[PDB]
Every structure is written in C-alpha cells, then in structure tokens.
Amino acid sequence: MNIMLTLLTNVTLASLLVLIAFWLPQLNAYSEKTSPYECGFDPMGSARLPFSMKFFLVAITFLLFDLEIALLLPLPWASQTNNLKTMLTMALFLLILLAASLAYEWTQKGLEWAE
C-alpha cells in the first residue's frame, strides 16, 4: 500500500515535469530543426539497420551466470541450517562449477570479441 503510493507519487511527479516541459515554453518546429543529428551532415543510412554485436557470446554467458547468482542468493538463510557441512559442500560445489565455466570459456576464447 505505502509502496504503491510511493510509486504513484514518483511517477506523477515525473509525468508532471514532462508535461510542464512540453507545454510551458514557446515552440517553433520545422522540418530542419527536427531532423536527425549526425554532426551537421545528413545520415547516409538508417539508424534501424542491423548493428553487429561483437560480444554476442558474452551475453549468453551472462544469462547463464545471472541465473547462477540467482541460485546463490538464498545463501544467507542457508547458513542457519543444522546441516552445515552439506550446505557448505553444495555452496562450494556451485561456486566451483561457476569458476569452471568461466575457466572453460576463457581458455576456449569465448571472452574475446569478434573481429
């Protein structure tokens, strides 16, 4: 409830700022002013053409490692268990497998951007 009210307040303040920005000043618009910016000359192509991503593999590895950290996040509560040895073994197992993934990709050149 309080968090919903806080989010509503923040969104309303930002929207009011946008509304004041777009309605208070004097406006003069013409085709030359609203043209896209490319340092004084016209753009040759379109900004919607495909843009090669040289780190496409690091992105996939990021997805996998992000869910690894999702697995790792509940560790502070896992430390209150009576099975401390089993908990410690499995935590270190997950971290060692994450390290193994990083080592494999690093040695197999997955961290190098495409040329």
């Binding site: 997805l63 996998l64 869910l67 999702a70 697995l71």
Partner: protein
C-alpha cells in the same frame, strides 16, 4: 479455484498460441517461449505458497534456471541462422521438406 488461477492459465494459453503462430521473426517466437515459462513460474509459486508446501519453494527457481538454459540455446540457434541467411526470418528455414 480463484479467478487469479484462471488469469494465469489464460496468460499461459495466450503465450502458447503466440508461439504456435509465427509471423516473420524468430525472436518474437522466442519471446513468446519466455512468456510461457514466466506464467508457469507464477502459477507454480501461487499454488505452492497457498498450500504451505515448504520444501517445494525451490521448484520455481529450478524452473527459472532451465528457462534460462532454453533461452540461451534459442539465442545461439538464432545467431547461427542469422549468420547464414542475413535475417532471423523463419521463411528461410525451408531447405528441409516433409
């Protein structure tokens, strides 16, 4: 059954019908595939939290993990297809016939 479960199952059905009806892009179908697992996550956690099945609370996390593995696999296949054909269109995957 509450109406919340009805809405979650309806969202799953919508995301399933989205996947089965391709338009042109393979990425849009992958996004439909990711929505299905999100609805599965929400439905599973609603069922588990209501029933106080304490030991089943870890199941949605494993569900998310294998959703990530599927998304990674699909993105890898998408980059290979795009390298071969110039676009992620599904019309180019027509070399093999039934």
């Amino acid at each position: 059954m509450p109406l919340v479960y009805m809405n979650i199952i309806m969202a799953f059905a919508i995301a399933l019908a989205g996947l089965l009806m391709y338009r042109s892009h393979l990425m849009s179908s992958l996004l439909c595939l990711e929505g299905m697992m999100l609805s599965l996550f929400i439905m599973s956690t609603l069922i588990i939290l209501n029933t106080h099945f304490t030991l089943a609370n870890m199941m949605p996390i494993i569900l998310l993990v294998f959703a990530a593995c599927e998304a990674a696999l699909g993105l890898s296949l998408l980059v290979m297809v795009s390298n071969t054909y110039g676009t992620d269109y599904v019309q180019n995957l027509n070399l093999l016939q039934c």
